[PDB]
Scaffold this active site. Structure first.
Site, PDB file in Angstrom:
ATOM      1  N   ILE C  37      40.669 -18.082  18.019  1.00 47.21           N
ATOM      2  CA  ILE C  37      39.637 -17.258  18.634  1.00 47.21           C
ATOM      3  C   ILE C  37      38.837 -16.581  17.530  1.00 47.21           C
ATOM      4  O   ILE C  37      39.408 -15.927  16.650  1.00 47.21           O
ATOM      5  CB  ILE C  37      40.255 -16.233  19.601  1.00 47.21           C
ATOM      6  CG1 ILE C  37      40.874 -16.951  20.799  1.00 47.21           C
ATOM      7  CG2 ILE C  37      39.232 -15.252  20.078  1.00 47.21           C
ATOM      8  CD1 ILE C  37      41.676 -16.057  21.694  1.00 47.21           C
ATOM      9  N   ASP C  38      37.516 -16.749  17.572  1.00 49.50           N
ATOM     10  CA  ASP C  38      36.620 -16.218  16.553  1.00 49.50           C
ATOM     11  C   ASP C  38      36.382 -14.727  16.786  1.00 49.50           C
ATOM     12  O   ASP C  38      36.863 -14.144  17.759  1.00 49.50           O
ATOM     13  CB  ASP C  38      35.327 -17.027  16.526  1.00 49.50           C
ATOM     14  CG  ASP C  38      34.685 -17.157  17.895  1.00 49.50           C
ATOM     15  OD1 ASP C  38      35.295 -16.716  18.888  1.00 49.50           O
ATOM     16  OD2 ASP C  38      33.565 -17.702  17.980  1.00 49.50           O
TER      17      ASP C  38
END
Ligand code: PN7
Lengths: 49, 50, 84, 99
Positions: C37-38
């Site tokens: 997840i960025d």
């Protein structure tokens, strides 16, 4: 004596008042968006990229 | 679309439909006016591949 | 108040923001390693949880909160001032 | 490829067929229609930057990228008469601005 006034209605140029109004309006827009960023950074979070 | 986010997918489809509807109010009806969809086409390509 | 009911809500928030199915969110699983997840989705999950739970976490867990087990443990050991 | 596709999800981000068909529809629109001096690439890039600024304003919950999107949308509205297609990216950005 022939005479004819040529339709040069688009050969205009800004006056001093119009030029000062354009300069001051762009400067106030930049200052307003800078203050908007200072309001948006109220929650503690930084830029980082 | 199952493995995708909800909001961005909805907003891509909505922007493409409203672009098609807004393009009828142009004064000239030419074929090279479809070149405005070159940015949305990659987005719809990703959605239509998933 | 229970860990196994806040996991069922945090998996819903992660599913809505990113798109992972809720059968993959287990408390032994990391964020930027297995879920991948960025950071823009990190900020979006943070503001969704601030909307729903009402707790504000500006920066104290921006660089110190790694896995979802640490998230739910933080939620458990912060909840002593219940507004309900 | 760097801002939109990793934003649309995980199944769009980890798959390769999505990347290849996004590149294909991009080239299939760009090559016959945007090799010139017309305002069409300006309007295409402006619609993308408007949607990206609005989408970044929703996530971080901040108003400055929404104001930047208003500036970019009004700027590409007056590139040519075909710039009226940016009102889609402007009108979708009302609900988020309210939120
Ligand atoms: P991620 O590590 O890729 O970072 C994404 C986010 C959005 C969290 C990034 O840290 C960020 O906050 N960018 C905001 C930048 C900004 O507001 N700049 C003002 C003028 S440069």
């Amino acid at each position: 004596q022939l005479s004819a006034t040529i339709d040069t209605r688009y050969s205009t140029s800004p006056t001093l008042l119009k030029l000062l109004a354009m300069i001051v309006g762009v400067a106030m827009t930049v200052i307003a968006l800078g203050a908007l960023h200072v309001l948006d950074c109220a929650d503690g979070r930084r830029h980082k990229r | 679309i199952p493995g995708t986010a909800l909001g961005p997918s909805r907003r891509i489809i909505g922007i493409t439909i409203i672009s098609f509807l807004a393009m009828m109010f142009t004064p000239t009806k030419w074929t090279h006016h479809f070149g405005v969809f070159a940015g949305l086409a990659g987005c719809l390509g990703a959605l239509a591949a998933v | 108040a229970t860990q196994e009911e806040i996991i069922a809500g945090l998996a819903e928030i992660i599913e809505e923001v990113t798109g992972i199915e809720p059968s993959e969110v287990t408390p032994e699983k990391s964020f930027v390693d297995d879920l991948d997840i960025d950071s823009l989705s990190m900020v979006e999950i943070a503001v969704q949880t601030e909307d729903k739970y009402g707790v504000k976490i500006p920066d104290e867990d921006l660089a110190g909160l790694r896995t979802v087990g640490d998230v739910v443990a933080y939620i458990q050991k912060l909840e002593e001032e219940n507004p309900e | 490829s760097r801002e939109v596709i990793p934003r649309l999800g995980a199944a769009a981000k980890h798959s390769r067929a999505a990347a290849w068909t996004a590149a294909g529809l991009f080239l299939a629109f760009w090559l016959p229609l945007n090799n010139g001096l017309r305002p069409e690439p300006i309007i295409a890039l402006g619609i993308l930057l408007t949607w990206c600024s609005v989408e970044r304003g929703v996530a971080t919950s901040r108003l400055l990228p929404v104001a930047v999107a208003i500036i970019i949308g009004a700027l590409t509205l007056f590139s040519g008469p075909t710039g009226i297609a940016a009102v889609g990216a402007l009108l979708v950005a009302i609900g988020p601005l309210k939120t």
